[PDB]
Amino acid sequence: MGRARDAILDALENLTAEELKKFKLKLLSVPLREGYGRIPRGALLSMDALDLTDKLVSFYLETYGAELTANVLRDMGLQEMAGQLQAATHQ
Template identity: 35%
Template sequence: MCFTVRDVLVRNLEELGERNFKKFRNKLNEFPVIEPYRSIPKARLEKADEDDVADLILAAYSNPYGVTVTLEVLRQIDQNRIAEKLEQDLETASNYKKPSNGHKLAGMMGTQRADTGAEHFVDRHRAELISRMGLVDPILDDLLSRKLLTDEHYSIVRSKATSQDKMRELYGFSRSWGVGDKDTFYQILRKHNEPLIVDLERSGSC
C-alpha cells in the first residue's frame, strides 16, 4: 500500500492521545519557525483534529520543513518515542523528502534563518490546479465568505467562461495573499476536490 507524508503524520498524531495532542497543538502555535514561514494561527488549531492539523502543517510549511517542525514539536512536549517512530515511518512514505541541513539546524535553534526557497503548496502546484480543477464556483463562494475575494473580484472571476480561465484569473488576485490566506485557500481547495489535492501531494510517486 502506498502511504503519503500526510498519512504518516495523521497516524502518528493519533497515537498521542487527547491530552498530548492538545499539548502538541499549543506548542505548534508557539514554535518559532524560520523565515519566510509564519506560525499557524492558534484559532485554526484549537478545534482541529489530527487530519486537520496534518493538513495545516503541510499547507503552511510543505514537505520537508513541515516534517522538521512536527518532529521538533514532538520532542519539545517530551514525545521522543513518537518522534522516533515518525522518522522511521516517513521512510516508507512515497513523497517524503528528507530535510536539508539548513532545515534541521533552523528547526532545532528556532531563531536562525535558512535559505529555503520554499513555495506554498498552492504556488508550487499552480499549473496543475489551474488545468485540473473542475468546479470553481463553490471555491469562489467560500473565498468570498472568508473575505479573501472582494465582491468585484468575485464577479470578475465568475464571468470567465471556463474553469481554467477562472482559476487563472483567481491566481492573479491571490498574489497579494499572505501565508495564512494561502493556508485557507488550500483548505478550501481540499474541501471541494480532495482527490486532486491528494494526487498532487503524492507527486505521482508510488
C-alpha cells in the first residue's frame, strides 16, 4: 500500500470516462524511458482504477508511479489533480 497507491486510486476515481479514455491512451502516448515497463493501451482499457493503481505502482515503484500518474495527467493538460496528486503522495 502507501500514499502513492491511495492517491493514484483517488485520482483515477476522480477521473471520468472521457478523462480515463484519454489517460489510458496518454499513458502509452508520451514515450517512456528505458528500464521501466509500458502498460499497453489494450491492457489499460481492460484495466480500471485500482487495477491500474496496483499495476502502475508494482510495475514501477510508489514514488515513480505517482510521479508518472501526475506527469501523464499533466501531459493531458490537467494541472489541478496533477499538483494535488503530487502533494497527496508527498506533501
